[PDB]
Structures are given as C-alpha cells and as structure tokens.
Amino acid sequence: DEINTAQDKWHLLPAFLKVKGLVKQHLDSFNYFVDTDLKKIIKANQLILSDVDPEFYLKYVDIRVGKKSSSSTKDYLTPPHECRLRDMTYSAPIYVDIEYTRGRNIIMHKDVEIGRMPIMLRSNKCILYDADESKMAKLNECPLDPGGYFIVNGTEKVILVQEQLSKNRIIVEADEKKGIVQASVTSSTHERKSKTYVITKNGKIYLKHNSIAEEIPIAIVLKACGILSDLEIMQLVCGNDSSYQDIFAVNLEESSKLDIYTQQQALEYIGAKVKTMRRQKLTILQEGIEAIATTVIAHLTVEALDFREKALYIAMMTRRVVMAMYNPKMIDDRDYVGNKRLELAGQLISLLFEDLFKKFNNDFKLSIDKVLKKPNRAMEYDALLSINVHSNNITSGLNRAISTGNWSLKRFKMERAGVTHVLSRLSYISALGMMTRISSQFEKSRKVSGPRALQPSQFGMLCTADTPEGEACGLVKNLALMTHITTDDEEEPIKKLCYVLGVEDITLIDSASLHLNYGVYLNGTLIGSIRFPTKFVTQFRHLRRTGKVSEFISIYSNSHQMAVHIATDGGRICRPLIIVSDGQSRVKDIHLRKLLDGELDFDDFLKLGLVEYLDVNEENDSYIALYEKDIVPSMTHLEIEPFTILGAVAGLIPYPHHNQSPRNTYQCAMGKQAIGAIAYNQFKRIDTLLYLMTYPQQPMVKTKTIELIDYDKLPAGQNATVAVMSYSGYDIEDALVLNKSSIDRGFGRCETRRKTTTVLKRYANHTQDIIGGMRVDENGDPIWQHQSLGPDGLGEVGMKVQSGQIYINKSVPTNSADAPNPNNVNVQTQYREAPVIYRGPEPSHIDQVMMSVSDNDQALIKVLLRQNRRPELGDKFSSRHGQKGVCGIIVKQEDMPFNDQGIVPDIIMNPHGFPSRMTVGKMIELISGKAGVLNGTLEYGTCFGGSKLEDMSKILVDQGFNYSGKDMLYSGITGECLQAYIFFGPIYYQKLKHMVLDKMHARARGPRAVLTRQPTEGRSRDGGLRLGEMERDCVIAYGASQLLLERLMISSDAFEVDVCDKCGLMGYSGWCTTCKSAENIIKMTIPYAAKLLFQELLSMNIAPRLRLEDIFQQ
Amino acid sequence: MIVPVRCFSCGKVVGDKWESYLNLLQEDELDEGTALSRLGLKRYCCRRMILTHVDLIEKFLRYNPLE
Amino acid sequence: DATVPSGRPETYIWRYLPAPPVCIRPSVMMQDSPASNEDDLTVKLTEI
Amino acid sequence: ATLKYICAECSSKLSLSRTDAVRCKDCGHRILLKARTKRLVQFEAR
Amino acid sequence: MPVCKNCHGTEFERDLSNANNDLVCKACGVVSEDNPIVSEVALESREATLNNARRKLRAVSYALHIPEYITDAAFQWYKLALANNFVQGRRSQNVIASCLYVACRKEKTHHMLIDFSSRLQVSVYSIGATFLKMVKKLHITELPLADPSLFIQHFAEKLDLADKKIKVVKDAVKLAQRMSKDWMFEGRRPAGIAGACILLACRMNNLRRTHTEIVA
C-alpha cells in the first residue's frame, strides 16, 4: 500500500501534537520559569548587606523547587486532587542556599525553605508528570484533564494567556489633524518608559517625553546624538532627493536660530529642560548634564556608549513619520497580529515573583538590622533563622495574588487587574476553553474603532471561527490547534553571525543608506544594511532550517519601506508548515512512511530541514499553497492541513465550510456551555456547581479535530433521531418539540451537583462551634423541619431533602466572639444554632458528605447535593451546528411523524431555521448520519474535508432509502400519508446549561435593601424586577397614570411622611422638629426613594422645602 | 454510562444486545455493521446506541472508595 | 430673593455641617464576629 | 462498610469518637467520607 | 423576643418557602415583620503599641506554624497583661513570647518553650523567667499540662521513614502511656522522655536512627 501524498499529510499533526502537547503554552512557559528565570532572579540580587558592621553579607547561590538534594523529585508532597477537596493550595516548597556571614571566620551555609511556590498541574514539578493510567488512579485524578491550571484555596482558576501590545518596537499612527504621532514603548527590567514623538505645528516636529519636560526640536536632539554635520542630516533622515527635501526642511531650519555644535549648546539645551535630579547625585549638572538621558531615558533598547547607534536609530525613526506626512497609508496599523505579542503564564508569574522577592529582601535588610542596633555581646547567631519568621510574604502574597487576580507591581508602577479566571468545568470542551483563550487588553476605550474587528492576517494563527461577545475592556480570542508561541532566543550570537554573513557595521556605513539595498533591522534596530538582500536572506533562512538559529529568529523582506527585519523577540505567534523548495514540496512522501512507522516523530523534521515554524511577517514575505494539487515552482510553503485554521472548540462543528460564519461563532460560544462527562474522576470530585449527563453518546459524525482533543471519549450530548417538519403549532420560531415515552426512555436526563461548604472554626475564647442536633420529639421520630439527618448530627447519605429540611446542622457559640478572660466557673455552653437549610424549587438528594480539616487545623465540612432534572419544558437545546432553542409542547408518543420502520423521530425540529440562517452544513450532517449508522462506521466529515456527499447516497439507495434524507412519514395524529415528504436522520443534540427550573423566578413581597428599600436584585437574594428609565417611558406613551402610580409607588415602596405645611420639611409622627408644633403638619404618602432623596439632599446643604395645597375646591 | 435498556424512540430492548455485541466484535474480527445487522437490529433508531454510546462506566470504576 | 428666612449670602459657606441620619448611613451587618463593617461617609465625618 | 464512615485512600471503615480527631486509624491519610445510611429510601422510576 | 399582638404567642416561625420571608406564630396567624429589611455588601499611644504588638505577633506566629486562630487568641492576652503594666519594662520578646505561649498551651497543641526560644539567641531561662512571672501577675488556670502523647505526633513528622511510623506511633503511644503509669515520668522535661519513647518504638519496629537524628 503506497501512502497517498495528498491525504497522508494529515498524519503529521497528531505526531506533532502527541509529542508537543495541546497546551504547552501554560506548561512550557511555566517550566522555563521554574527552571531558568528563578535561577536568574537571584543571580540578579544575590547580595544584601545593610549599612553597618562592614563585615557581613548574605549571598544567595542556588534556587530549587522541591529538591533538597535527597531524591530526584520531591521527597514529600500532597496529591493535587486530594488538595482540591480540603480547600488547600497545591504547592511545592521553595529551596534556597545562602553563603552568608555570622561569626569569626565562618561563612557557613545550608539548604533552606523561604516559602512555597504554587506549582502548576502537569508541569515539570507536579506529581502527575509522566504518570501512567494507574498511578493516575492512585492519585485519584483524571487522565484526560488538560492541565496547565494552578490550584489555590481549593479552587483552581488559571493564568489566562494575556495578549499585550508590541513593546520595544516602532509604531506610527497617522490621524486627521495631528501630524502622525510615532511611539516606541520600550522596557528592559528597570523602568518601563514610553517615548511619544510628534509634530507640534507645520512640519515642526518634537519629542514629547514625560521623562524630559517637553518638546525638543528633532534637529537639536539629533545633534546631541552625535551627528553634527547637519547638512548630511537631510541625506540621513530625509533621503536622497525625493520630495522630502522641503517637507523636512522646516525643523532643520529653525534649529539654526537657537544653537549649534552640541558639545556645549544642544547637549546643554537638553539638560536645561530636564526635571530635577531628585536631589542627591545632581553633581553631574554639567554640559554632559543630560547626556545620561540622551544615552538612557527609555532607550535601554539601544543606550550604549558612543552616540552613532542611537543617533541613526532616532533618525530612521524620524524618516517614517515624515514619510507619513508625505502621504497617508504607508503606516503600520496597530491592528494586525504581526505587531501584537502575547505573553504566557511563565513570564506573568516572574514579573510578580521577582517583585515579591525584591520586597522580601527590602524588608529583610530591615529585620537584619534590629539585631544590629544594640551591640549585645558579640552579635552573630546567624541572624538567618528569622527568615522563616519573615517568609510567606513570598508565599501568601503570591497565593492571594494568583487567586484574586489583582497584580500589584510598583516596580513598573503599573497594576493590572482581572488576569485569572475560575477554570469552568461545565463540560470537557470548556476545560480547555479557558485554556487556549487569549485576553486582549490596553487599546483604551470600548467603542474605539481601531482595535476591534477581525483582520485577514489572522489566518491559522488565531481561531477564525470564534471571537465572541465577552468584550468588557477588551476582546477575547482563541489560539489555533497549531500555534507554537515563540520563546526568547538570544541576541548577540545572531548579531555577530549577521556580521559573518557580510553585513557592515553602522559605523562604517557612510551617508547614503536608504539608497543602498534596503537595510537590516534587528529587533527593530538598524545594524548593517547589507548588499544583495535576496542572497543574504536565502542564505540565512537556510541556516534557520538547519544548523543554527532555530525556531524563531525569522526574517522577511519589505519592499515599500526599504529594510529587512530580523526579530528574535519572544512571546510571538508561529505555526508549522511544509516547505516547497524550487519546483515542489520537500516531503517526497517517503518521510511519512518513515514517520508513522514509529521512528521519525516531530522536531526531527526541523533538524532534517523539512518543515519550520513561520512568523506572521515572514509568511507575508512567503508564498503559500493549500492543497498539494496546487504547487507552482514560484511557491515557497504549503500548509500541512487546511482545517487547522479552526480553533479547539470550533472542531466540534461538522462541515464548518458549508455554513456562514455567525453560526460557527454562536456555536464556538455556546458549545462550551453544553453538558457532558467532565472527566473520569467525575464522581470522586466535589465542585461548586457541576452538571453532567446520564447517557452521553459520541457525535455520529466526527470532525477529525475531535479525535485529537479526545472529545469522543468524553462526549457531551445525545445522539437524537430528529425530523425536520413543522409540527403542531408549538414548533414555530426556533422552538423544538420533544417526545414523551422517549425523554422518559432516558433522553438528555441531567444530574446536577452542588455543595455548600461550612468551615467550623474555633474562637479566641477557646470555644468550638458544634454540629450536634437530632431533636426527635414525642418518642422515636425526628421532627420534620429537621428529620432526615442522622445520629451524627450531620447530613447523611442518600435521603430526599427539600425546602425546610436540614442537611447540615451547625451550632455556633454565642459569647465566644466576646472577649474571654481568665474566668470560667463552668459554662462555655450557650449556643445559637444557625442551621443552613436547603431552599430549592425541587426535592433533591444528599449523596457524598466529606469531613476534613484544612492546613490551619479547623473543622471543615463539605457536602454535595444532587438532583436529576428531567428535560422539562423550557430547556435550551443546541444542534452542534449553530442552532439554538427550547422545547415546545411535549408530544406523547403515538402522535408525531412515524414511518416505514416505524421509528418515531425523537426531537422534531423546524424547517424555517434553515433559510434565513442559511446553514446547510447541518442538513449535510443529517445525510452523513443516516449514512453512517446503516454501514456502522462513524462517518467522518471535517472542515474543508471529510466524507463527500455524492458517494453517500450510494450507501443509502442500495439499502433502500431515498438518495436524500427525505422519506415518507405517516402522521400519527391522523394516519394518512404526509402530503409532502420529510427529511430526517440522526443529528447530535447537546442539552445545555440554562435549565429553566433554575431560572423561573417570582416574588410577592420580599426583602428590601436597608439602603434604598426598593425590591432587592436578582434571584438568590429574593426576587423583584426592574422598570428602567428606558422602559418606564413605555407606559407614559400609553398615557396610563393610575397604572404607573400603581407601579412605581404603591407596589414598590409605599411610605408615609409627615410634612409641616409651614416651612416644608419632613418630620416624624407629631413633631416638625424645626419648629416644635405637632399642629400644622399634614400626613401623606410618597415614594420612599423620594424621601431618601429629601434627606441625602437635605444633609448636603440644600432644601427643596415643600409647599402644599389641598386637592379639592379647584 | 451503561448502554440504555431501550431506544430513545423505537423502544426495543437493547442492554442485553450490548454485551453479546462487544463479545461478538472482540472475538471474530469483523466489521461494525454486519455484526449488528445479524445481531437483530434492522432499524436504525435501535442501532445507533449499540453503535454510538461510549461505555464510560469502566473508566469510572477506576476510582472507587472501596478499592 | 431675600425673603428674610435664609439670611442672605451667609449660609453658602459651611458653618454647622449637618450629619445625615443613620438610615442614610446604614451600619453594615455585623457579618460574623464583632468586627462590624463601616460605611464610608460616617468614616468621613467621624474624621471631620 | 457497616459503621459510620470510611477514609478516602485507606478505605477502612472508621467509627469516630465525639470531638477526637480527623485522622483515620489505619493510614495517615486525612480526608474521609460519611458512609451510606442503612435506612430505607424510596425512589420512583419514571 | 416580641409577642403576638393578638394571640400573645411566645414562639415565631419565619417562613422561607414562597419568598415572602414571613414571620408569624403558630397560634396567631398574625404576622410581625413583613418585608424583612436585610442589608447587603488613628493616632494614639496605646492603640499604636497594640498595632506593633500585632506585628511582632504575626511575625513569630506562622514561623512556628501555629493557627491564625491562636495568635488573635493570644493577642488578647497581651492586651490583658498590659492592664497590670507587667509588660512595660521587660524585653519585648520575652513578653510577646509567653503571651503567645500560654494560648497554644491552653489549646493543648504541640509547641514547646525550649522550641520557642531558638527564634532568638536567648537562653530558655530569661523567657522561662518572664513567663513564670506573668503567671504571678495574672491568675491562670491549671489546664496547660502537656504530655508526650501530644509531642510524639509532631516529632514523628520529621523522622522521615515511611508509613510504618504511624504503627510506631501506636507502638510508642501505649509505651509512653505505661511509662507515665509505671511512675518514672514525673518531674522531667517532657520533650526528652518523648524522644526516648520514639527511640524505643523505632527500635521496636527495627530501624536504625541515630541519637543525634532524634535530638535534632
């Protein structure tokens, strides 16, 4: 069997994804953190000595997590799932080593805990890492759990991969008015800093830099950066000839009216407008006063020592803005992916860690001193063991951070909020749905038109099938199935290599540059402007694919602008695909048999120089094919598979290429809200609100992208025999109609699971809160409002509870919270019993009730309740395909369409959805379904592929069915033939969240807020609903007075006020109290919000004093 | 979980026809369908279940309090 | 308008600052032990 | 099995005193359950 | 606490069923509270010193891995010992020390005065002295009598080894118990006889663990 070059491309991706897991993004960055950066952070500060006793020092040397130099991995740890029950945090301890100084000639050292890092599941350091299917069982946890999510305080959450604007690169924004601001916001460690640069008026262009004061003419700074000839500046920043002559000439002009020869003036004129030096180290107020700032303000990008590099840099940045001033367009738009870099969980931790650590020292220099103030004998005694005293600023400070998600960074003086989100298990898809989700940010307001829509440059490197409604501050996206997020590589080696290949250093480059070839930029910095752009590139790219400079460090030509960028920056989006070199592809079909034979795998191609990750810009500079059927000798790359364009969730849609997009977007949005198997540990785990389905089923048609994510071993949905027919009237608009004697046969039956945790916690009074109970009046039975409990006084297993019952009886001590004293003759006794009750619309059951204790040693009780919801009227069902709906009438059995083989279509759907949704991919999924089930093979279909439709029919017709699904049906409510045919075959309907029995909500008169008194918000609390400023107008338009007054007055807050006619003000009962009367006052009624405004006003100094008049006699 | 004991529509007894199915496939290497069709499911309402329906209950029974 | 009740442009600068009733300033529920959550204005004027 | 409740990992039936410890007896594992009641319970099938 | 204005009923049920949240008595039917209004959402010499005591308190608190609980338990004890002005002129550590100590003593946990000092260079006498003095200047109950039966737990934790120690635990426990019964327990520093019991049961379980490794 010769392997088929057209198809067998497909066998790449699983091996790709088998080796390098689906989520490396959270995994690998976290590994690279715990291994590399931790070693680097202390390598930055290994020395702390406060100023006293010149002989002392504390030298950090090693960092490790969970290895004290005993065993390979940790000698002791806590199983993660077990940690998920106790509300603990899953952690491995930090270990350090410090050569230090205590006494005479000593310099001792050790291995010490400074605290506990909360390591991530399925990392390098987790217990789960490489455990096989059995150790999985002993650790009582799911094999299929994606992993890559932390767990703290018993919940888990996640570090949501957080997209960020390009940092330390060039950006140019044009605009109406203005004059085209440019910006480079550049940060390395110390001092994030922005430099904005723009025209002020009429060709006159300045640096606005909040570091410096304001507005330096570009010719001045350009001088002070070392290019003094000033009439070659035109050759540099302007160009050779062009039109830039006059356009730029204005700023070069009035540079003359002020100064010249920067060695004094311009260098000084800079330092004249600087801010203060912050007192000390002002001594360098000089002519070189500001030369520091010229060298370093934000430009730690370049900085360095002589002035030419930075000079020509700022120059080539000035060129592009005057180019924009010549014509619009010709400007980088802040939009497309190429200028966006995303930063995984590894770095986002590091920036928090090295802060908390820097604090740990900054206070530890203090706690080292209160020893050294008072010369108590000879003071040594290591001073060390106080570090444990001083710790958990690193641990607890880190826990509280990762749980809450408010990152306080004073080092960059910038505080982000809302990073983490609770990992949401409603299903198996959502479990990786909070993974592979990119949180967009920055980009100022909500309506701003620039950073919103979806750009075509996004092909295959970000999911095109969903970009949902979750905006808030910024839009949310998803990665593809294949994205390898660029890590950092290195800088100097690729540099001096670029010299080796024949560039020439910026110094020797003279005058004309923009003339010669294009130029070459390294991370957005000019170096060599090599001759012969083409051969340079092709050579270089040939190295990237073989022996050096691997993965990223990509390269691409640019025509319009003359340059060739070379970027090594990390945190950048990539994707694999196959090279077609010269004539045709590099695969040659022999490597694939050389592959699935079992000895090739992936990352082996990269050494072989076959496939390589691309870069957004780079693929722009490439030419790419799709199907091997298209290769032209002019081509460069071919994608390995087309359907990798759709994201993780998007894979569930069969035949996405037969729909329009909005049905996929609504799908990819909702599918993660379906109900499913969760994980194999499903029953052993107790989570806050967890759904799950009784009898799940594989989706009949599989998109090949399911098998990769193992959705078929955890299917969410039912596979339901459906017929598209308008039926009863209850069908109509989107509304499904189900089937009794069918739903009763175990269709879509839901189990729900909740828990209420109650931590029994002792009080400073040496007093414990107790679980006793079980009153049992009148000889032998517990009272009903209690009953149902047990001898233990705690909820018991498997007993129906509803409404007033008590499923955990919690008594608290009364006087405990008071101030205890060294006096108790007898009683700690008296208890206030505050049992928690199960208030619910339907009876339910208690199954598994846990007693445990957290790390701080306090009783902890967690019980979980289950009720199995029958898919009652008013439930959301969805068709996998973009449909949505709610059951209408539930027909019995005998009614509803039937037929030749008497099958009674289970769900009976509606036709009218199809035309104006225009989704035919479903109506293909049907035929594929009836097809597959009759042969017995699950019949694949997949994005841009799958089982062709035209050979389906030949599977049916021979087996006795119409070549389309349309087949006669006998209306069961009559028994005649349906005068038109009906079209049906099994579709896959996945029952969703938003069960009605939750949502149905009603109120007579409920609680009131102490504050306003209006009805309190939402369900839970209680009920009551909302007439908004928007809606109230409605009843005005009708002109209904007594209704409105009957609504916004009597029904909501009906309130009496006693006002004094004279000097109108409010008073209680009899008195006016501004004038003692109890005489001139008249009672009347008024909305309580209105009174509340008369006080909240009248408190603030103002008084609407009420006049009055009687109603009658005109 | 376990194979349901009727259809969701046609109402034919099923759960028995699971074990004999899976046994019939394991031994006697044979296709999907021709197993089923000669196992007595000629309808498709009946058939999907035995054909669909991952059997999880084993992948659950890995974890059990008793052990 | 000088109706001789509001005493002409004197009042407009604070002299006696009236304290709003506690019903405008609901003391937040005890919420589990004698630490009893404040409300913000009462903290303000209680500083005044 | 017979008496009040069970560990998670040890899987050994443990009857607990009043206000004693959250430890199990056999193993050092901590968390535990409350084993199922012996009392009759009524379900309807439908 | 109130009474039915009609039946003069002495007992009330709140009714949470229909989301009225009524409050009515079985013998009346008349409500009492409808509409259950329910809420939602500096510089002083002594108070400052109390804050400082909190800080030195928290500091030494988790260092010994003691309950967040017991600290605010003992902070009150400090506030009490301030009243008799016992805490004025004596080295602050020795005060916050015992003030933190007697608390976890009364709760009957594993923490130990000899263990409690080594946070400092100091002598397990000065601390002991100050401690026993604040026993005079206050008046304190008998309860804090520790036994090895508590300490053998935590001592067993750092012994490394394996599950067998738990067995050893019961092997040690009933040992020490009889040792208390056999009458040669009294008047001795408890931590020592505890470690002796551990060495015994460990050897009883046939392992090799050196004396140094025990006294650590």
Ligand SMILES: [Zn+2]
């Ligand atoms: Zn009045």
Ligand SMILES: [Zn+2]
């Ligand atoms: Zn059937």
Ligand SMILES: [Zn+2]
């Ligand atoms: Zn056990």
Ligand SMILES: [Zn+2]
């Ligand atoms: Zn009454």
